[model samples]
Target: MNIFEMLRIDEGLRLKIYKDTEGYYTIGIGHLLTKSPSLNAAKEELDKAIGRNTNGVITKDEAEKLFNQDVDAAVRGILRNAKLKPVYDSLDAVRRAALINMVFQMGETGVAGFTNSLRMLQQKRWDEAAVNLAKSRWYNQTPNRAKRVITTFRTGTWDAYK
Candidate 1:
């Protein structure tokens, strides 16, 4: 599957605001409203996405549009990180998507902190990279999701798609 399709599966769709794992108000496909630059800014985007003054509700089409926008931002952010871009460039498409998913979930800076894992990825040491990925609080924070992403890194396959 393509990146967007993979993210759709990984993040899941939500038409209404809900608490994420960390209890942040989130919507669409893992779009964290609580962390938006400003509450007004967040509301403005929400209003535009839902085509009205939002009351924590969105339609499928609206959510899809927001998801696309969010994914775009995530990809751009990943590329903009000096530490991650080279490692990102070294990977095959499947592996690249796996990295994108990690960045999408944790933000580019968060993924950039995976020093050894990223080194392993850049060197194409798939098994080692996967092992390093597992040795983290991120893995424990969401074990099942982490397992799927780690498997993708390990095998260069679309584990999230499955």
Candidate 2:
């Protein structure tokens, strides 16, 4: 199962995808009392809020806040059930955590938007993948955050200094 399946929310619902004050994209689980019919409305509002706040940039701190200790534990349980192990298999613990944070921020579809870049990674085309990754519409929308993530993926180390 994919990460969204494990998360239990409908994949479409999961797309609320917003960034917090720290600039991480995330979905607010509960619904707001405004004019909304169902999950779709909530998701749409959440997406709008996210876009307004970050202008499309998502950061690690925002991710951590959205998925705190309890949420992280819950997500880990789902990962275990799928026998997928943790993302740590392909990346270091820090990098894996960061990637998940980004995924959580971007949602499956948003991340899937990086199709060519992901293929490049699978093919071990590091430089090309990094280039593709940095050239995204989202990246163009948020250069600093995108640069940080791309650098991390390319170097296999989070450049905290950046």
Candidate 3:
């Protein structure tokens, strides 16, 4: 197997998030407590969230907090994409939200891979941008989401998935 495959096999990927036996946050493989100080802070919040609870599960509220913190950082990171910044800021709220969602789903570098799409957006070529956005593995892997975002990219309106 390739090194990447070997790494995952060795790391023991987890399908869901769970804390360690000592009650620390962990997810995405056998991290048992996570990879960073920020994540540990979320873990602390999650611990508070599960106070006195019997079942070791997270709530939507807790999950929202985690994702909010995570997704916010993702958006902030997107600002570093100097090429995408101008076009990113030029869009209306819905379109801007879509861009942040892309950054949340994919990192700044990942979104930057949509090089042509960003340019199309800057040049006001919605059709071409839609085509470009729909060309990624992210699109093929999540057509339900892609359809919605593509509609936004193609029309600048929300939920045009028709």
Candidate 4:
């Protein structure tokens, strides 16, 4: 996991700066940071950053760096919490990746809110977990991604995503 793999699960090659649902000034790979004005990395390089003369722009290189840091913290933080612990060898790598992806998007607490989903995950109930994920607002909001997650959950296939 060189970290770009993690970003692919979330941002999916979108490089533009945009505000997410929580009103954070997010850039590449779901980064919640908008570099401070004085230490502005992109603006220091000036108009050459993205050719749009933006302040919050991130090069692909920059995006991967933030993705590495964020993914590491998310994985570490979630696994360290009381309610969740990994039995990695219990689940194959793709399912493992999907769980990490869920925790990344929803936070550990947010993932915890999915009662049936989490239960099914722990129980190794693949079909039930897929159903639970499909029934959520997260599914309604991102059906394709949800399908991808559900597919990976059920089949442990990591190919659709590169």
Candidate 5:
């Protein structure tokens, strides 16, 4: 499955796919849904805030707004019955991104409540990190994403372009 499919995006969401200044086609969601120079402006803003790349290429401020507007609500519903403050607090940005990406694809509870993966991460064990990540229900459900992420985690290399 491709990244968009893994993210479970629907047609009704009006998701737009476009290329960035870096020449990578990123999927975006919002009022302006098309490829344009303005997309780079949005992305530059978001990149500063999250300190990472967003498929939407939104500004950091915009990213936070979007997260609060969308992902936060979604995560809250998904994590309502679970406690993951400690886990979330302990992870580095990359690990946190990885976790959030997984949780976004899975659910917050499933990703945060991952005991083995949490343990491995706590110890900063790269090998075990890849192993535990690949052992999730998500892995069983989406083998290709799992393999790609596992490889990325192991190699410490995440390329925007596939």
Candidate 6:
């Protein structure tokens, strides 16, 4: 599946403002409106897209656009990271999607911190990589999402959501 479709399922499509599990103001496929990087530009885009600054709302097209931009940025993030780029390029589409989804959820720094898992992933040791990832605080924060992502990392199939 495409990253957009996969994230839409994983993040859910919210048209109005909502607080994520971490209590951040978010909208439109996990767009964080109260944080830096996206704090100003993303909110501005949302406001202009709906032509209102008061309403915490976004159109489907606007949301999709935001999702695309976020996904592109996450891709860039993975590529920009000196350590992650090689492992990322060595992955298949399904594994890459898992990695991108991880970065989307927790940022590049969070994913890059998985040194052991990254090493296992680089060595194509799926089971070891998944195991190392599961032993983290990230997995504890969201086991469901972590399980799905780890399964994809192990099996290299987009069937976790199915």
Writing each residue's lDDT as its tens digit, candidate 2 over 7-33 gives: 233212223444333344335331121
lDDT of predicted model 5: 0.52
Question: What pairs collide in candidate 6?
Answer: none
Task: Tell me the spans in candidate 6 whose CA falls farther than 4 Å from its real position.
Answer: 35-54
Clashing residue pairs found in predicted model 3? 14-29
Across 35-144, the per-residue lDDT of candidate 1 in tens digits comes to 55455666766776567888678888888877888888888998899989999899899988888999999998898999888998999898888887888999988998
lDDT of 4 by residue, 13-61 (tens): 5466665554545566776544444435434443443355656556787
Q: State how far residue 70 of model 2 sits from its true place (Å).
A: 9.1
The order of the candidates by lDDT, greatest first, is 6, 1, 4, 3, 5, 2
Q: What is the lDDT of residue 86 in candidate 5?
A: 59
TM-score of 4: 0.75
* TM-scores for every candidate against the unseen true structure: 0.89, 0.48, 0.64, 0.75, 0.49, 0.89
Where does candidate 5 clash, by residue pair? 43-57, 45-59, 45-60, 46-58, 46-59, 46-60
How many backbone clashes does every candidate have? Answer: 0, 3, 1, 0, 6, 0
What lDDT tens digits, residue by residue, belong to model 6 across residues 7-96?
888899999877787877789899877753444555675686556784567788888888888999999999999989999999888889
Candidate 2 worst ten-residue window by lDDT? 5-14
- Give the alpha carbon lDDT tens digit for every residue of 1-162 in model 3: 222222233333443456543455564433343434465465554465446332335554544455446555756776777976887778776677677767755668888878888888878898988888888888887676677667877877654532
Model 1 residue 21 lDDT score: 86
The TM-score of candidate 5 is 0.49
Pick out the ten consecutive residues of candidate 5 with the lowest summed lDDT: 5-14
